[PDB]
UniProtKB/Swiss-Prot annotation:
GO terms for biological process: serotonin uptake; spermidine transport; spermine transport. Its main location: membrane. The gene is SLC18B1. InterPro entries: MFS, MFS_dom, MFS_trans_sf, MFS_Vesicular_Transporter. The lineage of its organism: Eukaryota, Metazoa, Chordata, Craniata, Vertebrata. Proton-coupled polyamine antiporter involved in the translocation of polyamines from cytosol into secretory vesicles prior to their release via exocytosis. Uses the electrochemical proton gradient generated by a V-type proton-pumping ATPase to couple the efflux of protons with the uptake of a polyamine molecule. Facilitates vesicular storage of spermine and spermidine in astrocytes with an impact on glutamatergic neuronal transmission and memory formation. Pfam families: MFS_1. It is a multi-pass membrane protein. It comes from Homo sapiens. The keyword Membrane applies. This is MFS-type transporter SLC18B1.
Length: 734
């Protein structure tokens, strides 16, 4: 942990300057922008100062944007393997040699200094023996730039680091220009520097042009991720503390609710929805550490003040005190649910779906510990004071949770809330949670009364029925959260089919007389535990889906947009609990349970029908599939098909790449964006053939006179603005 990491928490300005010379032609560029190293983002706006550039812009991106090594996003594991910010305020020197294949050479000398809050790098270039008819001076490069991995090694003799890497440039004809970069990074400070081990940095790039700027300009968007060494498997000290603290608050919440589970419900549901909304909006401004101790402290008093309601007689001293308690029952659960969702998804960045299932399963052990209330606490005091004694250990979690939860801070986000509810996808997923919570809240007042009028069973015996539905939720929550995380494209099929079964289960719960199904006890047990399987399969992946929908729209990553999303998850769980039971008592008056379960499910039937056709009709994401590689004897012919989805193939180019086993990936063939020019590898020139079907959205590569040298895994490459590759298929010649 070096000193310079503390100065990088936040958006810091950037300024860039370059004075270069190619073959006696002088040029100079300058610009400004902003970079944030908390989540690895960099925006660089270059403006050419001499008015014209003899070299293409992507040849100089690796000196300008790749010269800003200090905005790397290092994880918690490799804070110690970080050389760039190790002595950052002093600055450092990048000395680069940039070798172009069968072209000239670049020598780069760059100084990085930290003056005030502005980081200024000054770059001197020298270019030699560029060919006039070549790719560089001929300007045959497309206006695109692609991803790369950069490998870092250390050096003790100069106390700095060394690196070697190779970028690829797309050519208008179709080929690839290869550039090999050797950099030496030396620190000019006399303080301690960090010498790391071997690792790499994934660079993702985006090129853009301003609509209003006329003079020759270029806009760089850069994402940097650092990786390279295997995680040890042991969880960090932050991950263990959040998991043990969030599990205990859901255990005690169901523990006290397992004993005490007209205008009051109207007062409750509006101020439960209001407290879940605004207190989730200002999660940035209040502080998530003080949220998780504010909810359980107020909810700790709810367990205490319920006992003292017995002392007062009925009237203004009883009813008005039921007005206050709940308010504190609602707002503190609304606070505890939104706080526990925000603090847990930050702790597990790529495990959001799995840890919700693990958290909600341990809350399903809470109602298993129900009749332990009747063990000794009910037999000792009865109903007067069992609550204050249990409330101590709830309130004794205060010194533990204040010490064991980490402290986070974040700048408030300038996005309005809103805009988020105006999305087409957030609106339809709000309808599903409204529909799913409506069907859950109907059975709480009304299932026991149907059994009483038909099967004539006591409500204590109906208490076993409710544990039948909770037994299926507890086992469905981890497994359906386990499969939600590993396959992100199938969470949209997993959730819509979850609501569709719930419509079908509830259709047959109280059977319509047209259906001619006889109702009995063993059928009621079987049909309800299936409904637990369907409800748990639809309630778990709706939180990572909204988090996925926010980041694709353009919202930032961190504590800001996580707070606004988790506020809605408590909010749309509350609107189901308002129109569920209250209209449930309305619709129970009309006909009865033989239709009140059928009409409850048609609203869930239209809920899965509306969003299910929204995902089906207009899903679009860039995916590429290869198929057809097999065992071919030498001298034969083969055909390989790359199929594309998400983008039109007519206006973009397609390339092919090979991977021999144990060898570096190499380019095979390319076609221009106009469908007129093409290029091939020089070793296989004239023996392969590239082709496409534009209206079919397919590209084909045909192989004539195969040799054992061509045994490789083949991939299919496209540049939309971000680089995409296909899965790749293996071709063996033997």
């Amino acid at each position: 942990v070096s000193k310079g990491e503390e100065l990088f928490t936040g958006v810091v300005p950037i300024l860039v300057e370059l004075d270069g010379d190619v073959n006696g032609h002088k040029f100079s560029v300058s610009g400004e922008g902003e970079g944030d190293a908390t989540y690895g983002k960099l925006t660089l706006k270059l403006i050419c100062t001499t008015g014209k550039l003899p070299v293409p812009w992507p040849t100089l991106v690796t000196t300008l944007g790749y010269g800003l090594q200090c905005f790397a996003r290092y994880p918690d594991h490799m804070k110690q393997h970080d050389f760039f910010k190790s002595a950052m305020p002093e600055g450092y020197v990048q000395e680069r040699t940039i070798f172009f294949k069968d072209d000239g050479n670049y020598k780069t000398r760059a100084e990085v200094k930290f003056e005030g809050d502005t980081l200024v790098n000054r770059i001197e270039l020298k270019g030699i023996d560029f060919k006039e008819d070549g790719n560089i001076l001929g300007h045959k490069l497309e206006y695109n730039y692609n991803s790369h991995n950069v490998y870092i090694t250390a050096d003790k003799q100069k106390n700095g680091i060394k690196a070697n890497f190779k970028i690829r440039h797309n050519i208008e004809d179709g080929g690839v220009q290869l550039a090999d970069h050797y950099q030496q990074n030396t620190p000019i400070g006399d303080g301690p520097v960090l010498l790391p081990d071997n690792h790499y940095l994934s660079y993702q790039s985006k090129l853009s042009k301003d609509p209003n700027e006329k003079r020759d300009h270029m806009v760089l968007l850069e994402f940097v991720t650092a990786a390279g060494i295997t995680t040890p498997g042991w969880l960090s000290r932050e991950q263990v503390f959040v998991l043990i603290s969030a599990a205990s608050v859901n255990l005690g919440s169901m523990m006290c609710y397992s004993i005490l589970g007209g205008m009051i419900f109207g007062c409750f549901a509006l101020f439960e929805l209001l407290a879940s909304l605004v207190f989730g909006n200002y999660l940035v401004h209040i502080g998530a550490k003080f949220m998780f101790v504010a909810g359980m402290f107020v909810s700790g008093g709810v367990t205490i003040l319920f006992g003292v309601l017995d002392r007062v007689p009925d009237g203004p001293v009883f009813i008005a005190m039921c007005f206050l308690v709940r308010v504190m029952d609602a707002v503190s659960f609304a606070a505890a649910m939104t706080a526990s969702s925000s603090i847990l998804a930050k702790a597990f960045p790529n495990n959001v779906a799995t840890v919700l299932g693990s958290l909600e399963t341990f809350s399903g052990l809470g109602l298993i510990l129900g009749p332990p209330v009747g063990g000794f606490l009910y037999q000792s005091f009865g109903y007067e004071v069992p609550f204050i004694v249990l409330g101590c250990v709830v309130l004794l979690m205060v010194p533990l949770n204040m010490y064991i939860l980490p402290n986070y801070e974040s700048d408030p986000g300038e996005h309005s809330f809103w805009k988020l509810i105006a999305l087409p996808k957030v609106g339809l997923i709000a309808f599903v949670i409204n529909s799913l919570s409506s069907c859950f809240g109907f059975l709480d007042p009304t299932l026991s009364l149907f059994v009483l009028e038909k099967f004539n069973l006591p409500a204590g015996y109906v208490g076993l029925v409710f544990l039948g539905m909770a037994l299926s939720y507890a086992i469905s929550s981890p497994l359906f959260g386990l499969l939600s995380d590993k396959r992100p494209p199938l969470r949209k099929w997993l959730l819509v089919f979850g609501n569709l079964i719930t419509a079908g289960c509830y259709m047959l719960l109280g059977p319509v007389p047209i259906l001619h199904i006889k109702s009995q006890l063993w059928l009621l047990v079987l049909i309800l535990v299936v409904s637990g399987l369907s409800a748990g399969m639809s309630i778990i992946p709706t939180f990572p889906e909204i988090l996925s929908c926010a980041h694709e729209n353009g919202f930032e990553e961190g504590l800001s947009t996580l707070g606004l999303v988790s506020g809605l998850f408590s909010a749309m769980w509350s609107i189901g609990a308002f129109m569920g039971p209250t209209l449930g008592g309305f619709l129970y008056e009309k006909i009865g349970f033989e239709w009140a379960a059928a009409i409850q499910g048609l609203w869930a039937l239209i809920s899965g029908l509306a969003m299910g056709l929204f995902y089906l009709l207009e899903y679009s994401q860039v995916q590429l599939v290869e198929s057809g590689g097999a065992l071919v004897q030498p001298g034969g012919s083969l055909r390989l098909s790359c199929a594309a989805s998400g983008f039109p193939v007519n206006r973009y180019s397609m390339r092919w790449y090979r991977q021999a086993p144990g060898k570096e990936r190499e380019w095979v063939a390319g076609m221009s964006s106009a469908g007129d020019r093409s290029s091939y590898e020089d070793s296989v020139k004239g023996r392969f053939t590239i082709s496409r079907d534009d209206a079919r959205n397919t590209v084909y590569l045909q192989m004539n006179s195969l040799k054992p040298e061509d045994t490789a895994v083949y991939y299919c490459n496209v540049n939309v603005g971000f680089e995409y590759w296909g899965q790749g298929t293996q071709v063996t010649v033997s």
